[PDB]
Subunit: 352 residues, 4 copies
Amino acid sequence: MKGFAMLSIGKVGWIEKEKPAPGPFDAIVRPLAVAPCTSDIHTVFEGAIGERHNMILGHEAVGEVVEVGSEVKDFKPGDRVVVPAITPDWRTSEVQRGYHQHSGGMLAGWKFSNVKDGVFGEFFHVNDADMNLAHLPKEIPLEAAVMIPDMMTTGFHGAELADIELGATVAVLGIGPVGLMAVAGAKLRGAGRIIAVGSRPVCVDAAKYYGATDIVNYKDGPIESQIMNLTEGKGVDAAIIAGGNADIMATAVKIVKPGGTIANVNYFGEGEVLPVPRLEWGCGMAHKTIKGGLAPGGRLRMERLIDLVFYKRVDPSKLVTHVFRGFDNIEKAFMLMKDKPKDLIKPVVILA
Amino acid sequence: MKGFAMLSIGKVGWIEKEKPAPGPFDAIVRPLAVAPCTSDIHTVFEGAIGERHNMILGHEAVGEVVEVGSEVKDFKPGDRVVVPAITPDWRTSEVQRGYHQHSGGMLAGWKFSNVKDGVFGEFFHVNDADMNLAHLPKEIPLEAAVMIPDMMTTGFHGAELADIELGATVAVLGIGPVGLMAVAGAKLRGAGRIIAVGSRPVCVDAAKYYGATDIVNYKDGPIESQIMNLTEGKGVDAAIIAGGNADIMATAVKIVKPGGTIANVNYFGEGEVLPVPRLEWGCGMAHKTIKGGLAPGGRLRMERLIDLVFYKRVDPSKLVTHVFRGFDNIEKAFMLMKDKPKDLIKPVVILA
Amino acid sequence: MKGFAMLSIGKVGWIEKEKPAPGPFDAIVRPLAVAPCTSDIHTVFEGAIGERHNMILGHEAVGEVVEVGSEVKDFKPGDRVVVPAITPDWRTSEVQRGYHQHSGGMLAGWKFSNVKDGVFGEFFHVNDADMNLAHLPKEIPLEAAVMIPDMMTTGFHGAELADIELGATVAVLGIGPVGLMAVAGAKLRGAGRIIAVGSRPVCVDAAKYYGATDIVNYKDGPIESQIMNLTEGKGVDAAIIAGGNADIMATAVKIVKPGGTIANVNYFGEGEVLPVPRLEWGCGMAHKTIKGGLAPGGRLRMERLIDLVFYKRVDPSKLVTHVFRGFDNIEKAFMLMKDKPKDLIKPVVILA
Amino acid sequence: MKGFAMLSIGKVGWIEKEKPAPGPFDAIVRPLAVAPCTSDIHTVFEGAIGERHNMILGHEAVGEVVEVGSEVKDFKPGDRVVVPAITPDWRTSEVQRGYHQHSGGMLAGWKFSNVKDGVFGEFFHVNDADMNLAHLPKEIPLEAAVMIPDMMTTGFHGAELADIELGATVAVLGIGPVGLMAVAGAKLRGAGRIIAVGSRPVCVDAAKYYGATDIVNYKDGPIESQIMNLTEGKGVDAAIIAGGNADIMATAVKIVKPGGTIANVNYFGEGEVLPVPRLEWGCGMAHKTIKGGLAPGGRLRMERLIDLVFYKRVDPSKLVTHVFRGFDNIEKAFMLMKDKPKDLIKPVVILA
Ligand SMILES: NC(=O)c1ccc[n+]([C@@H]2O[C@H](COP(=O)([O-])OP(=O)(O)OC[C@H]3O[C@@H](n4cnc5c(N)ncnc54)[C@H](OP(=O)(O)O)[C@@H]3O)[C@@H](O)[C@H]2O)c1
Ligand SMILES: NC(=O)c1ccc[n+]([C@@H]2O[C@H](COP(=O)([O-])OP(=O)(O)OC[C@H]3O[C@@H](n4cnc5c(N)ncnc54)[C@H](OP(=O)(O)O)[C@@H]3O)[C@@H](O)[C@H]2O)c1
Ligand SMILES: NC(=O)c1ccc[n+]([C@@H]2O[C@H](COP(=O)([O-])OP(=O)(O)OC[C@H]3O[C@@H](n4cnc5c(N)ncnc54)[C@H](OP(=O)(O)O)[C@@H]3O)[C@@H](O)[C@H]2O)c1
Ligand SMILES: NC(=O)c1ccc[n+]([C@@H]2O[C@H](COP(=O)([O-])OP(=O)(O)OC[C@H]3O[C@@H](n4cnc5c(N)ncnc54)[C@H](OP(=O)(O)O)[C@@H]3O)[C@@H](O)[C@H]2O)c1
Ligand SMILES: [Zn+2]
Ligand SMILES: [Zn+2]
Ligand SMILES: [Zn+2]
Ligand SMILES: [Zn+2]
């Protein structure tokens, strides 16, 4: 009944809450491994989605089922499961339109640490267990598995939105844990040249590991003119935004060729307007499609990504640089996300 | 020959130029019916695509072939043809990528009054007659046929970009001649409710004629607040932008539901940045796809829209509010586009 | 209660069954109007999908909600509803893949008169009311509304699967009620020339009403020869199959041009294989895509087709050639579908 | 000029022909490396596309440009180039419709050893050199590069047509060179499990090399049965057909789940019809899309596959099991393609 929660905007700390009870279709899960996200920094310290009061944080968890509702059919207590960060209500009009990420409202499929208590507690509540849980194979280590709920689905969704054709040249703007899975996702969509944009040397090494053929550091100059030289004025076929300020939107439109695609998965927390360059967008007519999506969730998304991990299509363990232990280290791993060490990509806290 | 040209930014007038000469694959066409476009106002008086010097204007024309190159197979002198605004070079890498509008560079398939002398002349040059001309059936009048090169393909391209599903609710921002064709295109994509946004009474009558079920005038208040009341907070499935300043882009994102599409065909002439509202775009994750395209051209595009007029799927003659006559009246119709009268939609100058 | 049921393969009759009770998410409906389907002839007399025992027939119904479950939120007793022919279980993996029509197994989204008691009873059961019912606007009469559950969604799905481009030439093979809605559907996707294939004058008249520009009589001569002559050897951009024997598949492949689409919504009830002509399929390489699909259902599909009726995009009332009053005439209307007289398109029974 | 030609159906031999001259847009190329194809066996010995007289065989070649026309702007004599098997005329309506493979008619984008003298001569003619040749980087050896013109673009086209989603389970029916590249192609689309169906031990090794996770031998029982056991009766998300008689079409339909795709790239050379099984295709309604395509060609396609080789995304040299050198050994390699020894995958003849 203890959990690390967001007291208000700019203030965090442990609180005490009632242990959640499952509905007939729900499950209660105790976490075996969790991970903090930059998104919890964007909501706490930037108030990007408004004010909260005593909301448990955290949304990336592999856990063990301890209680199921009278209608749960595919999960028993004791089952080890990968919980997706997006756990929608599956009976809404948006699902019938094909957008479960927005089931019941904009971004409403994202429930943990948004409009529902997160996984940073001795237990948490997963709604619609048969639809929003996936069994964890015994062959996948806990550290790699906890990268599936959020980092892998978001990074891969960026590659999916980019509509990569075989052999296409892809740029990945941002090589944090999300952008690194975007680099992997691009390679899984059969990209040829993958140009990664970042600075931290631990991120640059992992980007090459996941298939980046070129590294672009802003120290050499503006990223726009730097990538344009790599492409001899042609540009990239797609640019995946996985970090940066609102101005990175303008950088993306400038480096993508006409007919190319700008695929955003970045959570912009500050700024009122995301700039789109009029001239580099063809004054409205360059066919530079812009996409920006919340990562898919639910049981099928996790099962699909479990197979990709299982059959060795992507190894997410290289995202995990720091492994803590014990509930108390949740606060420390969370604070590592506010001020990132230079040797950090993604921390993981193991609990049992 | 003589032709109405853009002397410099902000100055137009008639000039003297040699009659153009065709290559083995090209044709020389004399115009039978022409029409001016708002796009030529954006370039002349706003300098939206840079400076020009003595460039004949005009890109909407129905003509008669007067000379063909030794390699033209399908067109003879004396053929009456619909000339598209977009006449790309068809042997480029962009065409192999599937974006003929950008063959040779951004917007480079748009040649007339962009990088080439336009149709406001005694003759004009059409590159690759076999690929960029369509035969005009005797059953379609000159006034209806001259709407096909630019207005119809652009409006229909807005509806194509919008990814309309059967029964979807569509908003069209701007009900000038392009937006009027976007209301028609929306209906031809099977839209249910079509909410048109405009004020001019002549345009509103035409909007209803082409399918609009609701008329939104800014007089009642903000367009965003007005459309949200019409849809009980849900919004529209797609929004076609066919006019307005750079702020209309923000309006379209605010009124489109998550997972919807913003389809822009407006030529933005002023401002550096098209604003995209961070919050109403889901902070980057609302799956509100943004598109913006130059209208398709070439022979096949024209033949397909010719069939749409022939089989009575759309009557573009209702766009034509003014019918001038004589080469001299081209200057009259062009300035008539800088300050649109309240009873104007689209003017047409008949020549022979 | 009373109900018109499939006793066994080849025999139908009135039986006695228990009035269904709703689960927490379900509703009980009494029908106000019903219609019989050719699909129930395939099931009973051809045994097309196997034996059945005491299954009430029928899957096209508009009704009145009489009872709802404790969890039903959007529908109360007294509400007049349009009931889709397809009412899937929405919490399955197939829904997460995007194929609700096969929720639980192939064709399993189709419940009425497949794996569940149909609507030809004093009451029927609708699983998951909030997801599988739509409100009926008072402006839409009963006869028209009952064309929405199955005829309109199936025929429109043919047009959806055909991937119709603006101005394309489309052929519709079979112009019973489903094919007539495929003609209308092709019009709602922007088809130019629509070539309808059939012989019965009542259907030919309706096909012209719904937009057919050409009528091909299959008893007049070979369909393939006739359509090639009409298209000057080019073929059509798409052929929608809405009737005929297995060899209509070969006819469709033979008339579609390379890169075109064959879109089947016909329920084939006899024969081991459907033939694809090797040579006219380009020996496997002609890019003639073949689709075949169960019509969409659920609340959203009904609501979108209701808007197409409400805003007068389609008037399905011309499909109704026979209207009867009274429960016992369910038998008469059903045998009408078996006998298929020359003046029949679709019969409706009013129980109001 | 000497050349290995198809004299008539069932007979091949060396003939003498005049050395071709190029049009103003064309190039004459001398082969540095060539490879024979199973498709030529279908053509010569089954007559799958009719009778030919003294047609030089072969459509797989890397060569040196020896002469160009006056309008060729990107290639000079001495340039080493990858020549695609498909070299269409790019100025046709089919290119405008988006299908260069059928430019001028069904399969007409495939010219070499179809409607044009092939690459098995001292020189050959490439039409439209600027559009249909790709520069060959010095880093790619000749034997691997000659897998790009046909094997790689066909197998990858199968993965493209299969509409593969991340993590999906894919079956590849047939693992000769085309099927092995479909295995690599499926991996480049992000497939999870990949079930290869073959029996020759050398092909099984290569299939495991390119990413197969499961091997089904059509000797341990029916393919359909075994694959259903591997998938627990669920089936595969897509099946790529790359070999087999006409019955393989029925096999593919029986193993694909509802909503999945059957993607054929096999050249069927015998049989009047390809059987589609009525029940397992849902009596017409299972949403099992069937595609079948001639492989893409042209400059842009070769360039993108060159990049996938250059950046080490795929290594096609494992396809090459026999390398000879000498013009005369074209006959030797071709006959190996007829009577396929169990250690053969693809032979290559080196000429310089
Ligand atoms: N849509 C979803 O479902 C979803 C899910 C999770 C997270 N997100 C959001 O997506 C973003 C990425 O997640 P994350 O955990 O990987 O954050 P992160 O660790 O902070 O990575 C941000 C990256 O952006 C780089 N960067 C900073 N300024 C840049 C600039 N001008 N140009 C290019 N790159 C620049 C940084 O490079 P260096 O640090 O090396 O200098 C860094 O690598 C976050 O904002 C997150 O909130 C979205
Ligand atoms: N992509 C292409 O291929 C292509 C082709 C041709 C043209 N275009 C461009 O697309 C645009 C449409 O062409 P057009 O000839 O129809 O121009 P137009 O006659 O000036 O029509 C512009 C429409 O926008 C309305 N409008 C003005 N302010 C607005 C606001 N805040 N919000 C919403 N609507 C507002 C106007 O309403 P009222 O006038 O009734 O007050 C008018 O109906 C032009 O800019 C044109 O240059 C693009
Ligand atoms: N996928 C779904 O969800 C769904 C839904 C409902 C129904 N269906 C099925 O789709 C089909 C259409 O239903 P329906 O009520 O419209 O049946 P219908 O009235 O019997 O329509 C049959 C049409 O096919 C014509 N026909 C027969 N042989 C032909 C041939 N060799 N060539 C060309 N046309 C031929 C018939 O000609 P005539 O004009 O002379 O009769 C008629 O026009 C049925 O089989 C039905 O079971 C599928
Ligand atoms: N779409 C295009 O552009 C294109 C391009 C090139 C070629 N093709 C054609 O595609 C096909 C593949 O080419 P290829 O060079 O790879 O020929 P191949 O080596 O003969 O491929 C045959 C493969 O299919 C297997 N096979 C035979 N019958 C089978 C059955 N009932 N079930 C399952 N597998 C069966 C064979 O088994 P074994 O292992 O025992 O031999 C072998 O693995 C050829 O027909 C070719 O002409 C098409
Ligand atoms: Zn996160
Ligand atoms: Zn214009
Ligand atoms: Zn039916
Ligand atoms: Zn081949």
